[PDB]
Design a protein around this ligand. Structure first.
Ligand SMILES: [Mg+2]
Ligand SMILES: [Mg+2]
Ligand SMILES: [Mg+2]
Ligand SMILES: [Mg+2]
Ligand SMILES: [Mg+2]
Ligand SMILES: [Mg+2]
Ligand SMILES: [Mg+2]
Ligand SMILES: [Mg+2]
Ligand SMILES: [Mg+2]
Ligand SMILES: [Zn+2]
Lengths: 155, 206, 60, 98, 127, 125, 80, 24
RNA sequence: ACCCCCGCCGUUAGUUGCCAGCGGUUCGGCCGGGCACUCUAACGGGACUGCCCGCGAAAGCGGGAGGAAGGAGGGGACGACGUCUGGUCAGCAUGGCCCUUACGGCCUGGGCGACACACGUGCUACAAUGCCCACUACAAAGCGAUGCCACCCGGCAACGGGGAGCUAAUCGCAAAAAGGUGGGCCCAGUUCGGAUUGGGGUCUGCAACCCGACCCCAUGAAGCCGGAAUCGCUAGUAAUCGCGGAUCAGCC
C-alpha cells in the first residue's frame, strides 16, 4: 500500500442475524472457501450456546469479542542498534481482526472432537473471561506495559 | 529480442492473409504444404521480376495464385511464352489444375519486401551499407509514404564485429494497431556471411 | 534433422510403430503439430506472415 | 426443405455469402429460415516463442471456424436457379443436404 | 398477469417470473427450498422481495441454468429484482440503493501462461 | 475371537477386525462375512460362537494366511533371487525392483539417507 | 504382476533354432539378440548366450526360470 | 485420499474406472 | 488510443431455447405449435468527469444523481533508444575450420531410466472444518473416421463381444468434483496415509527383462504438520474442487 490508504472491504450482513461482525467471524472459520461448512459450524455453535446457556447466542458472541480485543500491543522497531519492542494502542479495526482471529485459533486449540462445539465452548469461556482466546489478549497487554519504558518511541 | 511481426500482429485488420481459403482436419495440412511448394518455385524463379506477394485463393481443384510483381514483363515472357512454362511447371507440382494471374506493383518503392530486397542486393554487391540504407529510406519516403525505416543486421562491411544499422523518417508506429505498416525482410548471403535486411513502410492509417 | 535421418518418409516401418511426424519444412521432429505438419517454430513463423489461412493471433 | 450449412474462417465472407443465398431464393421458394448463426469452434495453438528453452515465452494462435445454416423449405426450381450458379466468396465452402 | 426479469451472475442465467399469488417459488420444478436443499445462502435470492414487502403477495416460477447453485442464487436474486420493477417501476427508489439492480461483473480470471493460476506465480529457491 | 494362525482381533467391527490378520484386507473382510452370512458391523465381542466357527472355518480354509503366507512370499523372492533373475538381483542389492528411479526417491527401499562428502561450486541446485 | 495376455511371445530366431537342436538332442551354445523373447520348456537344459548390448553372456536355462525372459538373466548396466 | 488407487477419489484422480468407481 | 475476451441494453437470425401460452402425453419439452425467453453470432447503442455541489489559475481532487457499469469498469494482445561480448550454429538459415571407407550411412541390442549422495520444481499426506459407502444437485471450455463410443451382454474389474447414433449447438467423450441428505469410523498411526513388495490379469504395440499404463487380491512403509533459512498472492485474487486440450499406438 504505497499509494492509497486501502479502504476496508465492507461485508454483507449475516443471513440470520444480519450482523456483519458475524460474517467476519464466519469468514475466519472458513477454509478453502467452503463457506457453507463455515456458516454451519457457527450456527450449530450458536444453538449450542442456547442449550448449555440460557442466553441469546448473538450477545454471548459480541461479549466474547469484547474481552478478547487487546487495547495495547507491542510493535518491534529498530532504534539505535537493538530492536526495542514499542508498546502502543491498537486501532479499532485491528482490535477486531485480532479478536476474531484469536477466537477461532484458540477454539481450534480446544479438545472436543466437534468443530462446532469448540467454537461454542470457546465463545462462552471468552464471555466469562476465561479461555485460550482471552489468554493471548491479556498476554499481549502484559507484553506492552512491561516494555512501557521504550514507549517514548511512541511511533 | 522483443517486438512482434508487424503483419501477423495486424492480420485482423490493416493487412489480409497470403492464403485465404477454407479447409480442415484431413486436408488443411496437405492443402497447405502445397501452397509452400507453390511459393517455393515462384521465389526461386521470378526473382528478377521482383516478387512481393503470392496470394493463393481456392474453391476446389481450381487454384488461384496471383503473383504480384514490379516487372510484370519478366514474368509473362515473350508474347506470353514464359507464363506458359511456369503455369505448366505448376501443374507438374499440383495436378490440381490452377490459374496464374499477374498484377503489377504500383511503385515498388512502397513494397517493404522490394525495398528490402533492393537493399539486400546492393549489400551483396558490396555497396556502403549505411548509404544504401539512407538512400532506400529516401526513395520510399520520397515517393509517398507517411513514414519508413530500414534495418540491416550485422557484419556491416564484412567487419569482424556484427553491428546494426538504422535509418528512419516520419511516423512508423509499430505499437498502433491500425497503422498499416508494410513489413519486408530480405536475406543477403555473402563471402563473410548472412546479413538480414528489414524494411518498414507506413501508409495512411485508419 | 539430417537428410539421412529423414527416412521417415520411407513408409517401410517394417512395423507401423516406428513412424514419426517430422516437420514438413525444417524436419523439427521434436514438437510437430498434426493439423499443420509444421513444428512449433515454423507454425509461429508462418502464422506471422499470414500464410496460415484463418490463423489469427489469439487473445482473451 | 433444402438444408444449407455454410462454414468459413471470415465472419464476413459468410454473412456476405450466406446472405446472398437468402435474398436470392427469397423470390422462388418459401421465405427462408433466415441465416441462423451456430456456435463457432476455436482451435488454440499455444507455442513457446523462441527456439531453445525459455519455457515461459508462449504467445497464442487460434483458428476459429464459423458456421451458418439458413434452411429453405418449399424448393421451387427457380430457387435452384437463383442459387444453383451465382455465388462469389473464395474463403467459403458449402455443404447442402435437402 | 405476469412479470419478468432475467438476472445473470458469475456466469448464471435465471428466468424470473413473478405472478400475484401466495409467495411460493418453483425453481426448475423443485421447491425453492428443494433445489437449494441446505445452503445457508439461499435466503439471499428473495431479499429483493422483502425489500418492498413482497413475497407473501407474489409468487415466482424460475428457470435457472449455468454455473453453480451459488451463482444461480445471485442471478435469481437479480431476476426477482428486475421483474419486481416491470411490475411497479417505482420500486427502484428503494430497490436500487441496496444495489440489487446491479450485475456483479466479477468473473473468473483468465489463466495466464508462465503462471500457475492467472497470478499464483511459481516459486524459486536460492535465486 | 481367535481365528487364523495366532489371530485375535477383538472389540471392533468384525470386518475391521479380520483386517488385523496377515492375509486379510478390507476386501476379503466383507466377503468372509458375506458368505458366512454375519453382520459386519457386529462388535467382535458381541459375536456368536456359531458365527465364530463358520468364520474360523470359512476363512482358515479358503485363503492362505499368516505364517504359511509369509513363508510363500519369502519363498518366492528367494527363487527369483537364486536364479540370475535381474529382479532377483534388485532384491539382493536392496534397490527398488519395479523399475523406478534410483537417483533420487528410493528411501523407502534404501533406508535413511547415507550422506557423503561432495562437490560444491557446480550448482547442484 | 507381469502380463502379455494370450500368445506367449518368443522370437523364432532361437525358437525354430533351438528345437532343431532338440532333434539331435541339444547342442553346445547359441547366441541371440532376442532378449525380448519369453522362455519355453524346449529351452530348458539348453544354454543360450544373451546380449548385454555389448557382450554375449552364457545363460544356462533351467526349469525354475522358464516363464521369464532371457534378458532377465543378462544384466545391462555395470555398477559398484 | 486422491492417492489411494482403490477408492472413489483414487480412481477419479487417476481418471479411471474399476471395482471402486464403476461406470454406473 | 485504434484490436480481443468479460459487464448492461436493442436490431437482425431462429431445429439452442420454453405451456413463457394453448391442445395432447409412454407427462422425457416427448407431440403439434410458437419465437417470447435463455442462448447462439453479427451488428448497433452505452462512460465522456457528459450532468449537479465543493476547492483550483488550469489540469484535476473530493462529493453526489442517474446508470449494468466509471473517472484507465475487470482480464489480454502489445515492450522504446539501448544493456548483458545474454541464449540458440541441435529447428531452420549462414562465414570460416575439420571429416570423407569415413567425425558419413544401415541394422540388431544396450544407453539417454544407472547410484553412496547434494539441490530445484512439484504430487500425495500426516486427518474429525476429516476419511469411507450410498443416494441426490448445479459448470465451462474443448475434442471425435476407424475416431468419440450410446445401449445390451460376459468379467469384481481393467477390459472383451455385440451394436445405435454422430460426419458432431441435434450423437459420444461426460461422471463434474467440492456440495446437499442419510449411514458408518470415534481420535487410534486408525475405515488416517498410500510407499514398498508377492501374485493374478487387461490393453497398446513385431516386441513392454532392462523400461509402459490400467485392473483385482494380499502387503500397508515414512508420515502425528516440519531446523536455519525461504516462496506466492491485494478479489472473484489467494486458498480449494473437478473438467478439457495439445503431443500422442501406448505412456511414466
Ligand atoms: Mg511414435
Ligand atoms: Mg480456478
Ligand atoms: Mg484410506
Ligand atoms: Mg472541471
Ligand atoms: Mg500500448
Ligand atoms: Mg557469450
Ligand atoms: Mg553456451
Ligand atoms: Mg533425460
Ligand atoms: Mg459385467
Ligand atoms: Zn519446422
Amino acid at each position: 500500500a504505497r499509494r492509497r490508504r486501502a479502504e476496508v472491504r465492507q461485508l454483507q450482513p449475516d443471513l440470520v442475524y444480519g450482523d456483519v461482525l458475524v460474517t467476519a467471524f464466519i469468514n475466519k472459520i472458513m477454509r478453502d472457501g467452503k463457506k457453507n461448512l463455515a456458516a454451519r459450524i457457527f450456527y450449530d455453535a450458536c444453538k449450542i450456546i442456547q442449550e448449555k446457556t440460557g442466553q441469546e447466542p448473538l450477545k454471548v458472541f459480541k461479549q466474547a469479542v469484547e474481552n478478547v480485543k487487546p487495547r495495547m500491543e507491542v510493535r518491534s522497531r529498530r532504534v539505535g542498534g537493538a530492536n526495542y519492542q514499542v508498546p502502543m494502542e491498537v486501532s479499532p479495526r485491528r482490535q477486531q481482526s485480532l479478536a476474531l482471529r484469536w477466537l477461532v485459533q484458540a477454539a481450534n486449540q480446544r479438545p472436543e472432537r466437534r468443530a462446532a462445539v469448540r467454537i461454542a465452548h470457546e465463545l462462552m469461556d471468552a464471555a466469562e473471561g476465561k479461555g485460550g482466546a482471552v489468554k493471548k489478549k491479556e498476554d499481549v497487554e502484559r507484553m506492552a506495559e512491561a516494555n512501557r519504558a521504550y514507549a517514548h518511541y511512541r511511533w | 529480442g522483443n517486438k512482434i511481426h508487424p503483419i501477423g500482429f495486424r492480420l485482423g485488420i490493416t493487412r489480409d492473409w497470403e492464403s485465404r481459403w477454407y479447409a480442415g482436419k484431413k486436408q488443411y495440412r496437405h492443402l497447405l504444404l502445397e501452397d509452400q511448394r507453390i511459393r517455393g518455385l515462384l521465389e526461386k524463379e521470378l526473382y528478377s521480376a521482383g516478387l512481393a506477394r503470392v496470394d493463393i485463393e481456392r474453391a476446389a481443384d481450381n487454384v488461384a495464385v496471383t503473383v504480384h510483381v514490379a516487372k510484370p514483363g519478366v514474368v509473362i515472357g515473350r508474347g506470353g511464352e514464359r507464363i506458359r512454362v511456369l503455369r505448366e511447371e505448376l501443374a507438374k507440382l499440383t495436378g490440381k489444375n490452377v490459374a496464374l494471374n499477374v498484377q503489377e506493383v504500383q511503385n515498388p518503392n512502397l513494397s517493404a519486401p522490394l525495398v528490402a530486397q533492393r537493399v539486400a542486393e546492393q549489400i551483396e554487391r558490396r555497396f556502403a551499407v549505411r548509404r544504401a540504407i539512407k538512400q532506400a529510406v529516401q526513395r520510399v519516403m520520397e515517393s509517398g509514404a507517411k513514414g519508413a525505416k530500414v534495418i540491416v543486421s550485422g557484419r556491416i562491411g564484412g567487419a569482424e564485429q556484427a553491428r546494426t544499422e538504422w535509418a528512419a523518417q516520419g511516423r512508423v508506429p509499430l505499437h498502433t494497431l491500425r497503422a498499416n505498416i508494410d513489413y519486408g525482410f530480405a536475406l543477403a548471403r555473402t563471402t563473410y556471411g548472412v546479413l538480414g535486411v528489414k524494411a518498414y513502410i507506413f501508409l495512411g492509417e485508419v | 534433422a539430417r537428410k539421412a535421418l529423414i527416412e521417415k518418409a520411407k513408409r517401410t516401418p517394417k512395423f507401423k510403430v516406428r513412424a514419426y511426424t517430422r516437420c514438413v519444412r525444417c524436419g523439427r521432429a521434436r514438437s510437430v503439430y498434426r493439423f499443420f505438419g509444421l513444428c512449433r517454430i515454423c507454425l509461429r513463423e508462418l502464422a506471422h506472415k499470414g500464410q496460415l489461412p484463418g490463423v489469427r493471433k489469439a487473445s482473451w | 426443405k433444402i438444408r444449407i450449412k455454410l462454414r468459413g474462417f471470415d465472419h464476413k465472407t459468410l454473412d456476405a455469402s450466406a446472405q446472398k443465398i437468402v435474398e436470392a431464393a427469397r423470390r422462388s421458394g418459401a421465405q427462408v429460415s433466415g441465416p441462423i448463426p451456430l456456435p463457432t469452434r476455436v482451435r488454440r495453438f499455444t507455442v513457446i516463442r523462441g527456439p531453445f528453452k525459455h519455457k515461459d515465452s508462449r504467445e497464442h494462435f487460434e483458428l476459429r471456424t464459423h458456421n451458418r445454416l439458413v434452411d429453405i423449405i418449399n424448393p421451387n426450381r427457380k430457387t435452384i436457379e437463383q442459387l444453383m450458379t451465382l455465388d462469389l466468396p473464395t474463403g467459403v465452402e458449402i455443404e447442402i443436404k435437402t | 398477469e405476469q412479470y419478468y426479469g432475467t438476472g445473470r451472475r458469475k456466469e448464471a442465467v435465471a428466468r424470473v417470473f413473478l405472478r400475484p399469488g401466495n409467495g411460493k417459488v418453483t425453481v426448475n420444478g423443485q421447491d425453492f427450498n428443494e433445489y437449494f436443499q441446505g445452503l445457508v445462502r439461499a435466503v439471499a435470492a428473495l431479499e429483493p422481495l422483502r425489500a418492498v414487502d413482497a413475497l407473501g403477495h407474489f409468487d415466482a416460477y424460475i428457470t435457472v441454468r449455468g454455473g453453480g447453485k451459488s451463482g444461480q442464487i445471485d442471478a435469481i436474486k437479480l431476476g426477482i429484482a428486475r421483474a419486481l420493477v416491470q411490475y411497479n417501476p417505482d420500486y427502484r427508489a428503494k430497490l436500487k440503493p441496496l444495489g440489487f439492480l446491479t450485475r456483479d461483473a466479477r468473473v473468473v480470471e483468465r489463466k495466464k501462461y508462465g503462471k500457475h493460476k492467472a497470478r499464483r506465480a511459481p516459486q524459486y529457491s536460492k535465486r | 475371537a481367535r481365528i487364523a494362525g495366532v489371530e485375535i482381533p477383538r472389540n471392533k467391527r468384525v470386518d475391521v477386525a479380520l483386517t488385523y490378520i496377515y492375509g486379510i484386507g478390507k476386501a476379503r473382510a466383507k466377503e468372509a462375512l458375506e458368505k458366512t452370512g454375519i453382520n459386519p458391523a457386529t462388535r467382535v465381542k458381541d459375536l456368536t460362537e456359531a458365527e465364530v466357527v463358520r468364520l474360523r472355518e470359512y476363512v482358515e480354509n479358503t485363503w492362505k494366511l499368516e505364517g504359511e503366507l509369509r513363508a510363500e512370499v519369502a519363498a518366492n523372492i528367494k527363487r527369483l533371487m537364486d536364479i540370475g533373475c535381474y529382479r532377483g538381483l534388485r532384491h539382493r542389492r536392496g534397490l527398488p525392483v519395479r523399475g523406478q528411479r534410483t537417483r533420487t526417491n528410493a528411501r523407502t527401499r534404501k533406508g535413511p539417507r547415507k550422506t557423503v562428502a561432495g562437490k560444491k561450486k557446480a550448482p547442484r541446485k | 504382476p507381469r502380463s502379455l495376455k494370450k500368445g506367449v511371445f518368443v522370437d523364432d530366431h532361437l525358437l525354430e533354432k533351438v528345437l532343431e537342436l532338440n532333434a539331435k538332442g541339444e547342442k553346445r551354445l547359441i547366441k541371440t539378440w532376442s532378449r525380448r523373447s519369453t522362455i519355453v520348456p524346449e529351452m530348458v537344459g539348453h544354454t543360450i548366450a544373451v546380449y548385454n548390448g555389448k557382450q554375449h553372456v552364457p545363460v544356462y536355462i533351467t526349469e525354475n526360470m522358464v516363464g521369464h525372459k532371457l534378458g532377465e538373466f543378462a544384466p545391462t548396466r555395470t555398477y559398484r | 485420499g486422491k492417492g489411494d488407487r482403490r477408492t472413489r477419489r483414487g480412481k477419479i484422480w487417476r481418471g479411471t474406472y474399476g471395482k471402486y468407481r464403476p461406470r454406473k
